[PDB]
Amino acid sequence: TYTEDFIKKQIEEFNIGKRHLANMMGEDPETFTQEDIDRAIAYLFPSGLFEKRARPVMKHPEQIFPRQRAIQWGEDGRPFHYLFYTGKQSYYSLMHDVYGMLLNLEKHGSRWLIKEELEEMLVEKLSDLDYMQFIRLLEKLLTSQCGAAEEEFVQRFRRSVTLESKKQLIEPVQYDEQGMAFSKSEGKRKTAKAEAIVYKHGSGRIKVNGIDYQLYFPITQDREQLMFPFHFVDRLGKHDVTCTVSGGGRSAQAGAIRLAMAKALCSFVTEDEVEWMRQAGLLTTDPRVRER
Amino acid sequence: VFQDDPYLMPASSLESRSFLLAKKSGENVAKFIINSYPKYFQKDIAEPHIPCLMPEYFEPQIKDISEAALKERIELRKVKASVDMFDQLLQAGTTVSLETTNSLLDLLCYYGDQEPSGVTWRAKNNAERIFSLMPEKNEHSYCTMIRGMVKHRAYEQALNLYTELLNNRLHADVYTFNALIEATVCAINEKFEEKWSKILELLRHMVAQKVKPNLQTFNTILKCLRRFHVFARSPALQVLREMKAIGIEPSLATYHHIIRLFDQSFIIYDIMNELMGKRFSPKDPDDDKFFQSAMSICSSLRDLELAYQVHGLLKTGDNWKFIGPDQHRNFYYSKFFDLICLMEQIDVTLKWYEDLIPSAYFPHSQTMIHLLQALDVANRLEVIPKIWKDSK
Amino acid sequence: LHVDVPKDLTKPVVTISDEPDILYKRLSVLVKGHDKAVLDSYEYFAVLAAKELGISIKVHEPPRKIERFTLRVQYEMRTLYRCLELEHLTGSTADVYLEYIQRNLPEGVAMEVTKTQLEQLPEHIKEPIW
Amino acid sequence: HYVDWRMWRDVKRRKMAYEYADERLRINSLRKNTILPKILQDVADEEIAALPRDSCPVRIRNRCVMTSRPRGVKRRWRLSRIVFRHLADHGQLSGIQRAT
Amino acid sequence: LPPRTEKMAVDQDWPSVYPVAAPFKPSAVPLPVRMGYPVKKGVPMAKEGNLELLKIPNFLHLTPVAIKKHCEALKDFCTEWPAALDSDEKCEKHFPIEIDSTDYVSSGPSVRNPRARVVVLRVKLSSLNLDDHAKKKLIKLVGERYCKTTDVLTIKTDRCPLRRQNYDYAVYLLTVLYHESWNTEEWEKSK
Amino acid sequence: HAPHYIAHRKGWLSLHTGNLDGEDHAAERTVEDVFLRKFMWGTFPGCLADQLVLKRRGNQLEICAVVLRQLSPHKYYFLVGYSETLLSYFYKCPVRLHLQTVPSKVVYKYL
RNA sequence: GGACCUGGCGGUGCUUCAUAUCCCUCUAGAGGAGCCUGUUCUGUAAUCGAUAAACCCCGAUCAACCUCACCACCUCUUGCUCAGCCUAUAUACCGCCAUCUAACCCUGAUGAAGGCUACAAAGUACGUUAGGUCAAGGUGUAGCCCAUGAGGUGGCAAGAAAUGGGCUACAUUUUCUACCCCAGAAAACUACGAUAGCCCUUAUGAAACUUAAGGGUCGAAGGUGGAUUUAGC
């Protein structure tokens, strides 16, 4: 067990060690920060162990050692919080606040906070059912015409899961020396790697490694594959393509080219068509590869 | 030289010396094993070849009775074997080369009929027998005997053989004359004036045979002259002036001898004034004894500026290598730090205390008493706890 | 040391000979290791030394090598690389810099220094023989 | 003081293989060319045959240097699989790790 | 005894504590650094007695302060690149020939590496005094050593044991190739 | 920690260039390591608290060992000198020992 | 003898389903011949082990000599170690695998006893085996000790089947050539097919029918193989 005197001595030792490390690395001890400590300890004690926690670490004793309870009452004996005797002062204080916000309104891409990190925020163990009750209150608050402060309060209890699955990244339109607008993109299928350049205006001329596509791809199926992206958005005969592919085989090269042309063509179609191409599987790298 | 582990760091001067001696004894045991069984260490795997990591061979390889085996035994410093083989060559009627017998007689006179590890010159020792048996005795033979007797304290026999050398119309070398000077000073029952006159006569002879001195001649003159105290001061200063005039530069040994002759004392100021800023190289065996002696004076005179001057001379270049063995180092530093504590302001005393201890030396209890007295004089009584923790 | 400091120091003797000095167009230093963090620290050290001595240095990372084999129980050996390209440095700068960074080569790290010396044509190739 | 009799026999073979290598190479070089007359090639077949049988470089086996195991020996370490696995599992073989 | 890290000031001269490469000494390094995978409800192991910290090739002897102090003292050994040679365009003009040689630094009792004897000479044929016939004959003699795209003749010599001998042989090979390209035999007319 | 953590949580006891791609003399270094470990375990009986760490830089050979504070320091110095000299002459290289004493076995858990 | 409490049930049947392995169903192949490789017996002067049972493309990421620890004789003896034994013993132990078999608080009148409802009503905190294995992961003990140890030169017999594994075929979605996928011929008996047999060259080696690669000769059976079996993901 770690007595408070032990933690105090550890804090003093860490401060002196921080000043020593700043002396060693030539940096000013005053502005020396934890990122600087991490960089310096990575330089001085190089360790490529895969486990980041098995590497040398110089952290504040507060961070590295566990924590303890807080005092809930002073020497007079009176608890600080008015909901102390419930035994769940933090949770019920939060519920009380939410109910007051709902009363005020009644007078007038992301994920819900999960139970364990709610416990961390409240610093109180709570059951499943009371977690559900809190989440139902939060949902009820969201449904109402919540204001700015209310939306911030709700944002306190919602982390991110990312909404970018909606949106594929659109390449920027570049200009060649002739003044023709084009867009470049890359794709990969098995070991085949392709880079395509799609010109805004064209007549459907596709050049693979400086060769016409029907001569590079004798098999009809590969030409079907190259046709798929433009055909999907009804833009056959409206672009010129200059692609370079390397590695893989016949079908892997065809698929890599198809992905590269789809990603490059994303620049010249509407956002709705970008989403449609995404839902058709035309913008997703195929990860299926040979297993060991 | 020690290990930074707290359990192995020496805590006292005695402990430091004990640890060093233990380490050297371990090295010696390993060397004994290596030389005793070379067959386990002959396999060489190092490119480039390292000669210093190979076993050493101390045994004769030539076994026949021949002059080459004798030369081998002389190279190996195997005294008894060399004597026995010289006798066997005499019995075999094989005539020995003059150079070979001179090498043998070098070995015998240097080692005094003993094997490698004082030995007093024993009458009719092997050197004398070999010397008398020699068909032709050249100058080298006489010089080597005389030097040998002088080393092993046969001063009277050394002088007699020098007279015999003179009778044979042969010449003596510089080192021979140094030995004769030492022998004359070590001859008993003579007064200061007689010995000084004889030293002058030896120098007159060294003029006569066209022999030019070196540093060691003057150094030996001063070392011997040290024995005669106040009567010697002006002659010693005169000898120093002679050595400077002739173009032979003094060394640390010369100044050491002069200082220890005068200390029994303002010549040290001029000696320092001449030595300031100069860099020195090892020219005499006694050079390493200078700084100690110099520091001794600074303690007796209680002159701190002179102590700083001496220390600054020690710090210039590679001068520190002349601090000598650990006993001399501890003496020098103890006197130095005692003087700082006695005469310097307390904060500079504390700075010197932290810079010198334990990195330079391990203090003696007298130094702790002196430091406490200095703190008492300076009325900085807040420091006794740290000093006692250090002394513990 | 606060007070007890060396008064004068014997700097090494570096004699300027009369012979011409070698010119190295490039100097490729490939360091190999089993550990990426050591190679990163060594990159930091080498690059800082190059900057402080005025040498022109650029760093890159060749792809790693993995030797797998089986005795079932399957063992592996990873070899990671770091390449330091020094450029436009003479023979003496090359010698001093290489001695420094080779003496400070961490355990488990092997080095391969490729030196591209610049030379003139021999006088025997200036004109044909008659 | 080798591991066993079999290792000692192989140490004996490697010694003579070293001593006879130059002479074997030269006599073997005469027989591997279609220039010299067949009268000379036929005799070198006799000269090479008469040389001591253990001098032949084909009679040397790569036994383990610690256990004298005849098979399962990785030539790069001269160690049998059992001895290698012992050292590799203890992290005493620099750079060796279990694959993942 | 107590560790000496307690006696170290916060503005000391660290390079003097670790002048050269040495193994991690917990009683000399005044850092509360920890290394080890922690146990359940545990903390990474302290430095005292830690073998993992003892297995790291630490860079405590090369800190930025020490590196700068070392590189300031080592400036005296350097010579200056001739200013005339600004880029490769002038380096290949004033010094046509390029000699590549490689050194290998491993760890072991032996320094010998057989791969260090290889020498590579590279010269552009446009920098040699060759007429049309000489250039044609040189190309046909060298064969695949010459690359048409780069106009570079590459002679790699590794016959001799040493590197100086291989360099001499490469120079000799170039000389003989040039002189025999500048010679016309009887059979030449049979082209 | 088990053998499958050798590059994840543990390190390598011995460090040298032999096992790198393109390097030579791996077997020689391995045999040297085996002899060094046996020799040290027999020359420091009951002193070594943990395994040796054999480091190799250029021509050098550093044995960084962890020992106990049970044997007297004089014997430690004697053994260090003896081992340094004997191993230096046996391998024809400048060997060097870097003893680190601990009060007792540094226990990590109780398996 | 009356009333009550905990039960267990070391017990069953049925109902619904979650019901994954195991089923069942479903998909795609192989299985019948010719070879090789282990192994079984047999045979032999002729390695071994696997000792109840369930793990032979087992030790071996490799057997002309060596490897080799098997057999015939010949030949040496305090012997590479000062010995040495692939000699026995885990049917001596040891490693290994395997077979089998709390505290507190409330309620009931302070009885055995009981303690939950979320729009919340008392609950909070091993043994066993004539087992395997000495490629020892070990430690000991018994034997042989002018041979249970060395060394040399030659030899491990093979045809009856019984299996496993692999290879190669029985073709037309095929074979050859160009080419690397827009062609031309061949085609069921001079069709396909043999890693089948025999002969000749090349490689390595001291030694090659005896190991491998190619060429020639040859063009066998084979004609798609049920019960079964192999995977699926």
UniProtKB/Swiss-Prot annotation, chain A:
At the top level of its lineage, which domain of life is listed?
Answer: Eukaryota
- Give this protein's Gene Ontology molecular function annotations: RNA binding; structural constituent of ribosome
Q: Which UniProt keywords apply?
A: Acetylation, Mitochondrion, Ribonucleoprotein, Ribosomal protein, Transit peptide
- Tell me the compartments it is located in: Mitochondrion
Q: What is its main location?
A: mitochondrion
GO BP term (any one): mitochondrial translation
Chain positions found as N6-acetyllysine? K200
Of the GO CC terms on this record, one is: mitochondrion
The record's family statement is: Belongs to the universal ribosomal protein uS9 family.
Q: How does it assemble?
A: Component of the mitochondrial small ribosomal subunit (mt-SSU). Mature mammalian 55S mitochondrial ribosomes consist of a small (28S) and a large (39S) subunit. The 28S small subunit contains a 12S ribosomal RNA (12S mt-rRNA) and 30 different proteins. The 39S large subunit contains a 16S rRNA (16S mt-rRNA), a copy of mitochondrial valine transfer RNA (mt-tRNA(Val)), which plays an integral structural role, and 52 different proteins.
Name of the protein in question:
Small ribosomal subunit protein uS9m
Name of the gene: MRPS9
Q: Which residues of the full protein are shown?
A: 68 to 379 of 396
Curated annotation (Swiss-Prot), chain B:
Full-protein positions shown: 88 to 517 of 689
Function, please? Answer: Mitochondrial RNA-binding protein that has a role in mitochondrial translation.
What disease is linked with this protein in Swiss-Prot or TrEMBL?
Combined oxidative phosphorylation deficiency 51: An autosomal recessive, mitochondrial disorder characterized by intrauterine growth retardation, low birth weight, poor overall growth, progressive limb rigidity, delayed psychomotor development, hearing loss, and optic atrophy. Brain imaging shows abnormal bilateral signs at the basal ganglia and brainstem. Patient cells show decreased mitochondrial complex I and IV levels and activities, and generalized mitochondrial translation defects.
Origin organism is: Homo sapiens (Human)
**What is the recorded name of this protein?**
Small ribosomal subunit protein mS39
Q: What does the UniProt keyword field contain?
A: Acetylation, Mitochondrion, Primary mitochondrial disease, Repeat, Ribonucleoprotein, Ribosomal protein, RNA-binding, rRNA-binding, Transit peptide, Translation regulation
Q: Where are the PPR repeats?
A: 62-96, 138-172, 173-213, 214-250, 251-284, 287-321, 329-363, 364-392
Q: Gene Ontology cellular component? A: cytosol; mitochondrial inner membrane; mitochondrial matrix; mitochondrial small ribosomal subunit; mitochondrion; nucleoplasm; plasma membrane
Q: Where is coiled-coil annotated?
A: none
Similarity-based family: Belongs to the mitochondrion-specific ribosomal protein mS39 family.
- N6-acetyllysine-modified residues are K39
Write out the tissue specificity statement of the associated record: Abundant in testes, skeletal muscle and heart tissue.
Any one of the GO BP annotations? regulation of translation
Tree of life domain: Eukaryota
Give the subcellular location.
Mitochondrion
From Swiss-Prot, chain D:
Report the principal subcellular site.
Answer: mitochondrion
| GO cellular component annotations of the record | mitochondrial inner membrane; mitochondrial ribosome; mitochondrial small ribosomal subunit; mitochondrion; nuclear membrane
Whether GTP-binding counts among this entry's keywords is no
Report the domain of life of the source organism.
Answer: Eukaryota
Q: Which UniProt keywords apply?
A: Disease variant, Mitochondrion, Primary mitochondrial disease, Ribonucleoprotein, Ribosomal protein
Gene Ontology process terms (BP): mitochondrial translation; translation
Q: GO: which molecular function terms?
A: RNA binding; structural constituent of ribosome
- Subcellular compartments: Mitochondrion
Q: Which family is it part of?
A: Belongs to the universal ribosomal protein uS14 family.
Pathological association: Combined oxidative phosphorylation deficiency 38: An autosomal recessive disorder due to mitochondrial dysfunction and characterized by perinatal hypertrophic cardiomyopathy, growth retardation, muscle hypotonia, elevated lactate, dysmorphy and intellectual disability.
> Quaternary state and partners of this protein?
Component of the mitochondrial small ribosomal subunit (mt-SSU). Mature mammalian 55S mitochondrial ribosomes consist of a small (28S) and a large (39S) subunit. The 28S small subunit contains a 12S ribosomal RNA (12S mt-rRNA) and 30 different proteins. The 39S large subunit contains a 16S rRNA (16S mt-rRNA), a copy of mitochondrial valine transfer RNA (mt-tRNA(Val)), which plays an integral structural role, and 52 different proteins. Interacts with LIAT1.
Instruction: Return the protein name.
Output: Small ribosomal subunit protein uS14m
Organism source for this protein?
Answer: Homo sapiens (Human)
Instruction: Output the lineage of the source organism.
Output: Eukaryota, Metazoa, Chordata, Craniata, Vertebrata
From Swiss-Prot, chain E:
User: Where does this protein chiefly localize?
Assistant: mitochondrion
GO biological process terms on file: mitochondrial translation
Q: Name one GO cellular component term.
A: mitochondrial small ribosomal subunit
Keyword list (alphabetical) reads: Coiled coil, Mitochondrion, Ribonucleoprotein, Ribosomal protein, Transit peptide
User: What are the subcellular locations of this protein?
Assistant: Mitochondrion
In terms of domain of life, where is this protein from?
A: Eukaryota
Q: Which GO terms describe its molecular function?
A: RNA binding; structural constituent of ribosome
The protein's assembly and partners: Component of the mitochondrial small ribosomal subunit (mt-SSU). Mature mammalian 55S mitochondrial ribosomes consist of a small (28S) and a large (39S) subunit. The 28S small subunit contains a 12S ribosomal RNA (12S mt-rRNA) and 30 different proteins. The 39S large subunit contains a 16S rRNA (16S mt-rRNA), a copy of mitochondrial valine transfer RNA (mt-tRNA(Val)), which plays an integral structural role, and 52 different proteins.
Similarity annotation: Belongs to the mitochondrion-specific ribosomal protein mS35 family.
In Swiss-Prot or TrEMBL terms, this protein is called Small ribosomal subunit protein mS35
Species name: Homo sapiens
Its gene is MRPS35
